[PDB]
A paper describes a structure:
Because the [name] genome does not codify an adenosine phosphorylase, one alternative to fulfilling this activity is 5´-deoxy-5´-[name] (E.C. 2.4.2.28) (MTAP). This enzyme catalyzes the reversible phosphorolysis of 5´-deoxy-5´-methylthioadenosine (MTA) to free adenine and 5´-deoxy-5´-methythioribose-1-phosphate (MTR1P). The observed overall fold of SmMTAP is similar to that of members from NP-1 family of low-molecular weight purine nucleoside phosphorylases (PNP), which consist of a central β-sheet distorted barrel surrounded by α-helices, as observed in other MTAPs from human and bacteria. Furthermore, a comparison of the KM levels reveals that [name] MTAP can use adenosine with the same efficiency as MTA, which is one fundamental difference between [name] and its host and reveals a potential target for schistosomiasis drug development.
Numbering used by the authors:
A (entry chain C): 3 to 235, 242 to 294
B (entry chain B): 3 to 235, 246 to 291
C (entry chain A): 3 to 14, 20 to 291
Write the structure that this text describes.
């Protein structure tokens, strides 16, 4: 049986994706999650929603308790996490109103709790060195992309399509994010450096969320919402564009939950769990 | 109504820029500043001076309470902050004894309190996401540059002058800093990587000071003092640098007092309010 | 008189005894093994403790280095498992590093400061060439003496690279861990020109210089990180399997290096190490 957790970012502080059946006010061994967890169903598929920043968007990116959010969803029996992440574009073909189903990242965060494990008494016992070459659940990424196709949203894959298929607004079928600490936005100098490294978007919340999801044995995928060009490059139209983006992502998320529930995930879930065990350095040395 | 704060770095642990009127021992919601704050007048312009590292320079760059220093200057009524920052050059044209009126940076610091706002009880309530594309106050940058001209110090502007006009010692009219955490200096490998990224100087103290000044609604500009080439490639030179940076600061204070800042001060304050995402 | 400490990586003589020490900065990773190589006193310290329970970001580098300083060590030889970012550095090779790029954070990386849990002072140490060059060349000559190939990219051709070899120079990026790198990070580090990626070199190398000690690292290439094919992407089992095979050569190099160190006069080098610390004391 699957159960899909949803971590909603900017624009999803108070989602209302389904009829609320129950609420869970919980804590974890790592502290309090960002807010109450909301339980319900998309069709016959159990779903749990949590706003990354809390209902009033009072928690900044560096202070989000990523460990508690991921562990709370694990404790409720989630098998998957779908996340939204607002971002700035570093590249001309990613324009405000587009989305990116990320497959890669470069980490420039610091000072955040980014692992459940360690040698101190307040972390889980053991040492975990997780492979992160392709850090998302690929099967779940392809679900997000197919959900966009099913909801009549353009999909652009630069590996197989010419630039003529980059029709806006579109879901970019791959992409890399730099995660910065915030809360300040980047300088023009930083933006040009990240662009020169070949990164596609900049955001403040993907890491360590994606890392902790893999440590928890959960299938994780992010859909990033391009809200503007970062500073390497009217306001009423911007806010309206973001509103329309949120409507489209809500459509993608609900279709994605249905598509996840339509398939069997037994082997993928067992492989998620086995990857955690095989990454326990303290167990493999003995 | 303007009042100019001055944060003195290396070579400015005990500046004595003017006859002291008062000495302020203050606290802030973020702790105590690096030292007492000295207040007085330069001409008719009110001025406040604070040594970044304290009188004895006993506080290393990663342990400076940037939040307390900036907040204390704001509390005493400062509208502007002028800061000095010692640095190493990453570029052939920036030689020891030159100064740089910075306009950009790349941040490699960690573990420092870099914002006044958050969700924890030790910060002001709110989520503040400040634009930083051009992170300095441009009017105040141009004041530093005009102050150097008024004191007959060479200015080199790469966008409008040939390289043959780069006559040393000179004030470079623009430049980018990488801020590293310290206390160690860079390796040759790190210096070459920073150079290849296009950065001009390396220093340990610019960030988060520049960021917190904008959060506090203040106009901030830095003058960096090139002390040596960084290791991709002195005391007597630095003493002469301090003498001329002092002249620049004192002239810059006079020049700030010579204009109206009403709309810039208003814009500084409104930018903070418009950057509050929780509101 | 010289005395060589050895800080041992993942899978880590005439043993006299085992010693527990305390330090102003806490307890070292584990007890220390005291002995001799010939007539040269030697002390061995595992970086991660006996059960390998301490991850790289939580190793007490300050206590490990200071413990060896307090026992009278003049030299530290260190091993560090790593991933290769470059075609000619292959699993089973070794690198006598001469450079690094630091991406660690949150680790205690200096003995000095203004907080009560550090020594009083402000120490700004030069780090242009952050290793002891004399000791680096001892590690390379030790490999020659044990019939292990040495590859110098300054003087030799890729066609003349014979494996397993000790690479006579190289640069490391140190990441904080515990996770391995993404493919995107791996390619960015490769494009910066870095040779290997590891998690334990920094701040160990920096603190050794703060302590006035001669320090050199021999990195053990266990994998190609993750910039190559999917079957070559790093994981714990891959690191451990190659490490177990390479430690035999690393032991031979280290034991020979200790003998070579004890056969030379180090009076002025040691004086220079200490004088570098004193001249970096800005508060004085
Ligand atoms: N250009 C950018 N650089 C960094 N972060 C950005 C953007 C655009 C959006 N975000 C995300 O939105 C929030 C800040 O408004 C943050 O929560 C952040 O994740
Ligand atoms: N080459 C360099 N790299 C980094 N920092 C440098 C230099 C040269 C000067 N500084 C600044 O001066 C102090 C170090 O003595 C520190 O306070 C620092 O800001
Ligand atoms: N490809 C890689 N990236 C980062 N670190 C790596 C490797 C390969 C090995 N190591 C080092 O070995 C330990 C991880 O098990 C860690 O202690 C680490 O120092």
């Amino acid at each position: 049986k699957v159960k899909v957790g949803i971590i909603g970012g900017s624009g999803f502080d108070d989602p209302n994706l389904f009829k609320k059946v129950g609420v869970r006010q919980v804590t974890t061994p790592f502290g309090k999650p960002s807010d109450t967890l909301v339980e319900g169903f998309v069709g016959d598929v159990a779903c749990v929603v949590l706003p990354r920043h809390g209902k009033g968007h009072l928690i900044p990116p560096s202070e989000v308790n990523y460990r508690a959010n991921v562990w709370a969803l694990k404790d409720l029996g989630c098998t998957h996490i779908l996340a939204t992440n607002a971002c700035g574009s570093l590249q001309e073909d990613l324009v405000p109103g587009d989305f990116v189903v990320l497959n890669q990242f470069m980490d420039k965060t610091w000072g955040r709790e980014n692992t459940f494990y360690g040698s101190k008494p307040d972390s889980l016992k053991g040492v975990l060195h997780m492979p992160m070459a392709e850090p998302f659940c690929e099967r779940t990424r392809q679900i997000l992309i197919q959900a966009a196709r099913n909801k009549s949203i353009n999909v652009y894959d630069k590996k197989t399509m010419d630039k003529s298929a980059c029709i806006h607004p579109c879901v970019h079928a791959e992409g890399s994010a730099v995660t910065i600490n915030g809360p300040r936005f980047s300088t023009r100098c930083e933006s040009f450096i990240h662009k020169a490294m070949g990164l596609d978007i900049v955001n403040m919340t993907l890491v360590p969320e994606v890392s902790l999801a893999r440590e928890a044995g959960l299938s994780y995928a992010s859909i990033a919402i391009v809200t503007d060009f970062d500073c390497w490059k009217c306001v009423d139209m911007v806010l309206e564009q973001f509103r329309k983006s949120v409507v489209h992502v809500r459509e993608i998320l609900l279709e994605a939950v249905a598509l996840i529930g339509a398939e069997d995930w037994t082997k993928t879930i067992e492989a998620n769990k086995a990857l955690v065990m095989s990454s326990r350095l303290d167990l493999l040395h003995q």
